[PDB]
Structure formats: structure tokens, C-alpha cells
């Protein structure tokens, strides 16, 4: 009494189409904010915001997905804005959203030892000890 | 330098993707029939269907370009999209099945209605081409 | 004692102002994007729907209604955006429009048999077939 | 090359019972009205309650109101106006007189009757002010 | 185990002085003040120049800004919130009145001095208001 | 001219200060512990605490700066911040109490995280300049 409306190829032009939002930023409702703190307060008032989506950061790190289930909710269809921990320079955080969003990202030598420390704290999958 | 990857991201992201569909989290739009609310009573229009921007729009050239075209550049917003009247409440929460899990069990019945719009919000793997 | 007051130009005046409230367009909270998709839009340039009032649009239109008062995730203030099917054009909305603010709109030939279906399709007092 | 009147007969008695209902109900208000209560002689403000009212009735109906949304402007979709009122308007004159503008008629109590026509002689609203 | 006792006795001092310096630079202003008033209703100037605040000290010195917050029938979560005052309020008086809440102290020209006191008076705000 | 006085004006506004210690009303920021990294097994312990943007900018210099170079380029949007590793749900009780009333007692197992935390915060009173 029923057919079936299979498409095997779903996954994958799921696949190319999310890492795109890597970097046409469309539908975008995060926006992560570094908080290293180099070399003084003027050089950079209007830091840069990195573009994120929700679904991704809950599906990736388990810290951004308690915060979005238990946070108080303010505005549900307004961007939220964070401000990540002050280990983390701005380069690390850009490398671990491309990670969030591709799953495989490559590191300069003298941000590695950082990345890892940002995965930890911010229980992302893969980077995680637990 | 170094290269960071693990073993297995999509099939976490794609259980997430799973979910998403029935916990309707972090929904962006609205889908409603413009379809017979069984007919002269009036009695039941298509209430509203919660979606996301980016899956509708990965997997519907029609929604991708209606997306493009109609900006919602306020600070706050959700698209409320009224779909041509082929589309059965039936036939709409069918399709945003089949645009998250890519795929979809159907009853024999709704098929021609299915088949339809598929094609004609050309959802990648039912439209043909 | 008991009194009571009455105005009696009351509805003339309202009524004129409503009919001017399309065009000067203060206090919109709806706009009503137009997907006609002419011959295939390439993504160029928006639409650029047309503003409308709540009040009005549930007043007339027995669907705009529902979907304004039990909307399953809503807007809380402010403009609200919704897009219409292909099958009306921003010439149709546009006097289709009209004629729910101001009860007559001189539709054309041309176009009267879009305009007619597009009172079904979005249940509009006065046109509704039922 | 021809055209036609799309009309309809009895829009203008549907939309006007449509209006109403506005008043009496929250639905699609955009303003909220307060006012020094003048409860006793000497007004308590802490009870204060709000009065929900719609933007373009309150315009329409008195020009006192349609200057001020005027010339208070909206300057984002998501801002909601409130609107302290004179000191002189009783919250039940306000809220007769917030009926006044929508169903166009209104029944009052003595009592208020020359605070309430005093309350339209400031607000400047249509029948009650001069012009 | 211990119970230690944190304190510094001049925070109160540096507190106070934050808010006073808040009061000019504006900064984190989440309600803007309106006065109403007919003045602009001719092309020189329609768009009053909407005074910014903060909610917190309005609820800290006037008890019917207290209540217009605490309870209201609709709100926003995180927008500014825009509020006209009555006519009584040129720009200059309200603007007094908001810097009297903000740091308890202002000068006033006898003739700004009535409109001032009214308004205080109609405002709740500790301080002018007499109960 | 003239000149006007409220002699209890700081009085009165401390207690509708005090107040605001336990009460979102007014909040503008909310400040998250990300101390897992300690070894605890749980996958996440805390909630958003609550704070009032203008009263840490008036504490603390790390604060002050930050709500400054944090844009907040949309008007209806709000603020959420992660605090560094080193500080616990508890510790950072401790510290905005601190903040936002003058005094706070801490244990002495805790005396060691809110001190640090002083200086990672540079919340004056705790802080070295």
C-alpha cells in the first residue's frame, strides 16, 4: 500500500552543500567573537565576528549545545553573539569552525598546541578527552 | 605544520540532520498550503510547518532561489512561505522529510501528488533534473 | 447619571484612512514577497514585496488570519515577511492587495484570470469561491 | 485593452466589524498606553497598567496621537512604543476613550463625562475636539 | 575550613561614580525617552532628538517606571524599549529629569524649575515626588 | 538658576542594585563556566549565569574592554560569554556577587579560584594594579 522514495546520493550533496556555508556564511545566526587580547585594546575595536551556524556548533561540541538547549532564550530568530575564552586567538577560532563545518582542517605548527587545548574546553567532537 | 581531522564527521552530522527534522530546533521558516482545508468547511488549513533556511535551500533549487531573491535583511524575522496549491499538508511534511533524511516512505495514494511536487519545487532526486 | 457619546462621521473617516494606509505605508508590518519566477529568475535582484498591514490582511483574507494568529514559530514585533506561490505574480499581489484595503481594485483583462485564482488561493473575502 | 472593477459590496461592513474587535482583544497592538492614574484626587502612579491600542487607529482617529507616532520615530521593526499619557486622563477615561477611536461610540458614567470630553479636548480626537 | 570575608570600602564610591560617568557616554542604553509635544509638526524639525537611558536606574529612582517595566502587556526581550512622555515636558526638562535620576543632582533655570517639578511629581521619581 | 538634591540618592540606588544580584530583569550578558577541562565527567554542569553588561564594565577592566570591542552589530541580538577554563560555576558566583554587592565570603578550598580568577578577570579589589 505504500512506495518508497529512496535517493542515495542525499548525504552527499549534503555534504558539499553545508561546507559551503564554511564560507558563503548564508543563513548564518552565530556570531563568534575572539577575545585574545594581543598587544592592547585599540588595534582592533571593531574585532572581527566569525560567522557560524547553530546546528552546526550544537552538532559539533557538546558546550555549545547545552548552552543553546539550556540558556535562557532571548531571541529565537535574532543572532546571538559569543565571546570565546581569552586562550583562544582568532586564527584558532576560525581553524576550529572549519573543522566544525568540514571535519578536517589543517593547523600551522604554532597553533596546534592551541587548537587542542579550544577543542577540550570547548568539548568538540574529535578534539575531546572524553 | 599539521593536518587535524577525525575518524567519522558525517555520521555524527548526519544523525544531527536526522533529528533535526522531529525536534524542529533552530527552525527559519514557515510552510503553508494554500491546498483544500478539506474542502468548503474551511475547518483545517495547513497550520504552518517549521523548516531551516539551509536545507530547503541545499535541496530545492526552487527554495534556494526563493531565498535569494526575497531577503528578509531586518534584524528579526521567519519567512513564512505560502507553496502553490498542489501541495497537500500531507505532501508537505512528506517532502521536508525527504529534504532532511533523503528519504521518504509514501502511501500508494499521495503519489501522484508527491511525484508532483517534487518537480515542481524541484527537490534534487525527485525532480527529474 | 448614565450618558453616552457617539460619533457620527466616525466610519467615513476611518474607512478614508484606511484606504490611504496602503500607499503612504505607515505602520507596515508585512511584506509580501513575490516568487512569479518569470521564465526562471537567475537569483537577481529582490523582488521587493510589497508592505501590508496585519489587521487588514486577517480582516480579509480568512488564511492570512491563521497564518498571523497561530503562526507555529512567530516573529514577536515588528515587520513580518512572507513570500507568495509562483502562480501570482508582483503586478497580482500588488492589486490584489489593493482590493483588500480598499474593496475595488480596476484589475485588467490581461491578468483578471490570475487575479481570480489568486483570491482561492489565499481565500480572500469577496473573491472566495468556497 | 479593456479592464474591469473587481468589488466587492460589503467590504466596508465586514472591515469595519472586522475593527472593532481590535480593541476589545490584544491582537496586532503596537502601542501601549499608561497615564498618572488619578485614582483619588491625587493620583497613584505604582498601579499603573498598560493599555494595548494599535498605531493606525490611534493616527486616524486624533491628530494628538497621529504626531506623535510621527515625530517619535520607529527606528527598529522591534521597538515598542509606549505612550504616558496626560496626568489629567484617568485610566478609565483612557480606556473608553481607547474604545472612542475603535467602535466610534462609547457610553460613560457622569462622573467622568467632563474629564473624559476634557480628554478628547487634548487628545484632539475627531467629534470631541474642536478643529 | 574558612569562611574568608572579601571587601574594598571605596566600591561603592567607584560604583556610583561608573553611573555618573554612564550617564553621559551612554553606553548599554536599552530605553530612549520621547517628549511629546505638537512643536514639530512643521518641516523645520519633525524628528524629536530621543533622549537614551537605562532601564535599571529608571526602576532604581522612579516607582512608576518600575511598574511600566515590572508589568506591561507586551515587551521585547532584548531591543531598545521607546517611551513618549507627556506634553507637559519640554526636551530640556526631561533631560534634567533623567540626569537628577542618574546622578541625584541638577541646576535648573527658574523658568525650566516648574515644569521640572511637575513633571518629577508626575514621574514618581523619589526624591521630587511627595508620596 | 537653581540647584536640586537627593541626599539619599546613593542609598537608595545601591539596594536597587543589591536586588539586581539575584533577578535577570535588566540583563544584558550571560557568563558560562567552561571548566570541564578540570577532569569532571559530566558532559556540561552549568547554566548561563546572568549578569547586567554596565555594572562588570564598572568592576572590571576585562569586562569594560570587552562589551566595548564586542560590536553587537545587530540591535535585537544579546551576548553570551564564555569564560576562561580556569573558572568554575561556584568561583564565578562568588566573583560577581563580589561585583555587583562589594563583599562576598568564600570558602577557603575556593579562596585559591576566586583570587585567581580576580586577576583573570581584573576585577578590581582582587586584581594586582
Same mark, same amino acid.
Given at each position: 500500500?505504500?512506495?518508497?522514495?529512496?535517493?542515495?546520493?542525499?548525504?552527499?550533496?549534503?555534504?558539499?552543500?553545508?561546507?559551503?556555508?564554511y564560507k558563503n556564511e548564508?543563513?548564518?545566526?552565530?556570531?563568534?567573537?575572539? /577575545?585574545?587580547? $594581543?598587544?592592547?585594546?585599540?588595534?582592533?575595536?571593531? &574585532?572581527?565576528? =566569525?560567522?557560524?551556524?547553530?546546528?552546526? *556548533? /550544537?552538532?559539533? $561540541?557538546?558546550?555549545?549545545?547545552?548552552?543553546?538547549? &539550556?540558556?535562557? =532564550?532571548?531571541?529565537?530568530?535574532?543572532? *546571538?553573539?559569543?565571546?570565546?575564552?581569552?586562550?583562544?586567538?582568532?586564527?584558532?577560532?576560525?581553524?576550529?569552525?572549519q573543522y566544525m563545518y568540514?571535519g578536517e582542517a589543517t593547523?600551522?605548527?604554532?597553533?596546534?598546541?592551541?587548537?587542542?587545548?579550544?577543542?577540550?574546553?570547548?568539548?568538540?567532537?574529535?578534539?575531546?578527552?572524553?
Amino acid at each position: 500500500e505504500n512506495y518508497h522514495l529512496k535517493w542515495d546520493s542525499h548525504l552527499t550533496y549534503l555534504n558539499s552543500s553545508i561546507a559551503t556555508l564554511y564560507k558563503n556564511e548564508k543563513f548564518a545566526d552565530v556570531v563568534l567573537y575572539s /577575545s585574545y587580547n $594581543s598587544s592592547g585594546i585599540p588595534s582592533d575595536i571593531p &574585532t572581527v565576528g =566569525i560567522s557560524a551556524h547553530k546546528f552546526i *556548533l /550544537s552538532a559539533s $561540541s557538546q558546550f555549545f549545545a547545552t548552552m543553546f538547549e &539550556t540558556a535562557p =532564550i532571548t531571541n529565537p530568530n535574532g543572532v *546571538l553573539y559569543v565571546v570565546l575564552p581569552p586562550d583562544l586567538s582568532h586564527r584558532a577560532i576560525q581553524i576550529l569552525v572549519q573543522y566544525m563545518y568540514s571535519g578536517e582542517a589543517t593547523v600551522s605548527n604554532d597553533i596546534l598546541n592551541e587548537v587542542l587545548r579550544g577543542g577540550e574546553i570547548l568539548k568538540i567532537r574529535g578534539l575531546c578527552r572524553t
